[PDB]
Amino acid sequence: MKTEKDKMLAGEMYIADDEELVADRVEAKRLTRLYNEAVETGDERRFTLLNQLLGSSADGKAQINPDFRCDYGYNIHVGKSFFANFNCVILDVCEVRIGDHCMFAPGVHIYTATHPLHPVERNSGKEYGKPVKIGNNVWVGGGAIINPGVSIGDNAVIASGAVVTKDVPNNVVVGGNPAKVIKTIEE
Amino acid sequence: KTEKDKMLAGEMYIADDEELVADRVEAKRLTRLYNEAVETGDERRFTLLNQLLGSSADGKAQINPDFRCDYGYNIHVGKSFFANFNCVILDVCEVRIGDHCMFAPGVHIYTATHPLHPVERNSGKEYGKPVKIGNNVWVGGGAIINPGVSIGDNAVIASGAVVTKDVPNNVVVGGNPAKVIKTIEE
Amino acid sequence: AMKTEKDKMLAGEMYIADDEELVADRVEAKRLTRLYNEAVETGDERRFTLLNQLLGSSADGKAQINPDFRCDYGYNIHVGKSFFANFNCVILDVCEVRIGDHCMFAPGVHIYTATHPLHPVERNSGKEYGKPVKIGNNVWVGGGAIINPGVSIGDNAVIASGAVVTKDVPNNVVVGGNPAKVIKTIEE
C-alpha cells in the first residue's frame, strides 16, 4: 500500500528504478543543469531556478556555486543565508535538514543514500537512506563528507577533508578520517 | 613498439606522443557529449558511453555526470555497472571492474602515476599500474583507489577511504590510508 | 588610506566578502572559467589565451589545466613553467597562491587560501579572511589532496593522494594521510 517513494522517504528499502523515482531524478538532473548554467553565467534567474530545485529555503536566496548536484532536490531544506561553494553534492534520498547561517566550502558531500553490507541484499535492486540533520552556524570545511544518518549540532566546525561518520555535538571542531573531536569552541 | 604499447605494459611512456595526445583529446570531446546526454536525459547516452568505455558486459552502464577519464578505452566493466556523480577514472592502464559494482559520488580510480624523483618525473615520461575490482564491490563516496590496487569480491570501501594497497574479498576497509574495519559473512 | 575591502583581503586581514568589487570579481571569474573549461574540453587552441586572462600569471603562458577548473578570483594564482593540473582542481585564491616550476596536480586537488573565524558570531559577521599558500618547484600533488590555507610546500615534495595537508611541508619529502605526515624522504 506504500509507493516506492513512500518507502524511500521512510528509511525503508525501496526500488531505486521505480518509475516515479526515476522521473524525479531525470527532472532534477535537467533543472540542475539550468541552475548551474544560471549561476555560472551570473544570471538573476538562478534563484528562481534554485527555488524550484530545493525542497525549501528560509529566504529563497540560498547561494550555491557551480556545479551543484543532487538526487531529487525536494528533500533538501535549508535555513537563512545558506552558502555552498563549488562542486557540492547532496544525495537527498531522505531528508537533508540544514539550519541557518551554514557554510559549505568546495567539494562538500552529504549522503543520505546507502546500501546493505551484504552482496545479495545490496544487489537486490532495493536500497535505503538515513536522513541528515545539520544545525545552525555550522561551518563545513572543504571536501568534508557527511555520512548517512549523521546529525551535527549548532556552531560545529567540520575541518577540511573530514569524514564525519558519527553525530557531532554542538560547539566542537572535528577532523580526521574517521573524524573525531579535536577542539571545543568556548561560546 | 609504440608509446601506447609501453603505456599499456606499465612501462615508461612519453605522455606527449602524437597518438596518445589525440586519444586524450578525443576522450575529452566525447565525454562532454556523454555528460550532456546524461544530464539532459537522452537515451543516446548509452550509445555514447559504449563508444567511450573499452567494454561493458551489458552495454547498459549507468554513469552520472560529470564523468571524466583519460582514454576511456582502457575501462572494462561487468554488468549492471553504476557510478554516481563526478567519478574520475585515469585509465592509462587497464581498469577492470566486475559485475554489480557500485561507485558512490566522487570516486576516483587512478592507474596513472609518476616517478618520485624530480628529474625522472619531469622528463616527459610517465607510467601506470592497472587496477582490478572484483564483483559486488561497493565503493563509497569520495574514495580513492590507487594505481596497482586490487579489490576482491564483495568488498565494501568506506566513503573517504584512500585505498593504497590490495583489499581482500569480503572485507570493509576505511580510513586514510585505508585499513580493514570488519570482515563480511556472505 | 584610500584602502578597499579587496586590499584588506589580499593582505590577509578581515574583509567583507560581499563588497561589491569583490562580488563582481567572483562573477567575472566564473564567466571566464566557464569559457576556459569549454575551450579545454573541446580541444581549442585558444584555451591558453583564455587561461592567461584568468590566472594572475604563468611563467610561459602554456599552463595545462584540464576541465572543470574552478577558482575564486583567478588573478591571485601565479604559476611557474610547465604547470599541469588534471581534472577538476579547485583553487580558492582569496590570497596569493604561488606555485613554482614543473608542478603537477592530479585530479581533484584543492588549494584553499580562504578561511573563517571559529566563533559563530564573528564568522556570521559578513567578514572573513585568508592565508596565502606557497608551493615550490617540482612538487607533485597526488589526486584529491587538500592544501589548507597558509601552508608552504617545499621543493621536490610529493603529496600522496588523499592527503590533507594542514602544516608546512619541507623540501624533498613524501607526505600522506589525514593529517598529512612524512612517509619518506626523496633525494635525487
Ligand SMILES: CC(=O)SCCNC(=O)CCNC(=O)[C@H](O)C(C)(C)COP(=O)(O)OP(=O)(O)OC[C@H]1OC(n2cnc3c(N)ncnc32)[C@H](O)[C@@H]1OP(=O)(O)O
Ligand atoms: C551508489 C550510491 O550513490 S549510494 C552510496 C552513497 N553513500 C555512501 O557512500 C555512504 C558511505 N557509508 C559508509 O562509509 C559506512 O560507514 C559503511 C559502509 C562503512 C557502513 O558501516 P555501518 O556499520 O552501517 O555504520 P557504523 O558507523 O556503525 O560502522 C561501525 C564502525 O565503523 C566505523 N566506521 C564507519 N565508517 C568508518 C571509516 N570511514 N573509517 C573507519 N571506521 C569507520 C565506525 O567508526 C564504526 O566504529 P565501531 O563499530 O568500531 O564503534
Ligand SMILES: CC(=O)SCCNC(=O)CCNC(=O)[C@H](O)C(C)(C)COP(=O)(O)OP(=O)(O)OC[C@H]1O[C@@H](n2cnc3c(N)ncnc32)[C@H](O)[C@@H]1OP(=O)(O)O
Ligand atoms: C565557505 C568557503 O568557501 S571558505 C572555507 C574553505 N577552506 C577550508 O575548508 C579551510 C579548512 N580549515 C581547517 O581545516 C582548519 O585547520 C581548522 C578549521 C581546523 C582551523 O583550525 P586552526 O586552529 O586554525 O589550525 P590548528 O593547526 O591550530 O588545529 C590543531 C590541530 O588540528 C589540526 N588540524 C587542523 N586542521 C586539520 C584538518 N583539516 N584535518 C585534521 N586535523 C587538523 C591540526 O593538525 C592541528 O594539529 P595539532 O593540535 O596536533 O598541532
Ligand SMILES: CC(=O)SCCNC(=O)CCNC(=O)[C@H](O)C(C)(C)COP(=O)(O)OP(=O)(O)OC[C@H]1O[C@@H](n2cnc3c(N)ncnc32)[C@H](O)[C@@H]1OP(=O)(O)O
Ligand atoms: C598529475 C597526474 O595526473 S598523475 C597522479 C594520478 N594519481 C595519483 O595520485 C597517484 C598517487 N600515488 C600515491 O599516493 C603513492 O602512494 C605515493 C605517491 C605515496 C608513492 O608511494 P610508493 O612508494 O610508490 O608505493 P608504496 O605503497 O610502497 O609506499 C610506501 C608506504 O607509504 C604508504 N603509503 C602509500 N600511500 C600512503 C598514504 N596515502 N598515506 C600514508 N601512507 C601511504 C604506504 O602505506 C607505504 O607504507 P610502508 O612501506 O611503510 O609499509
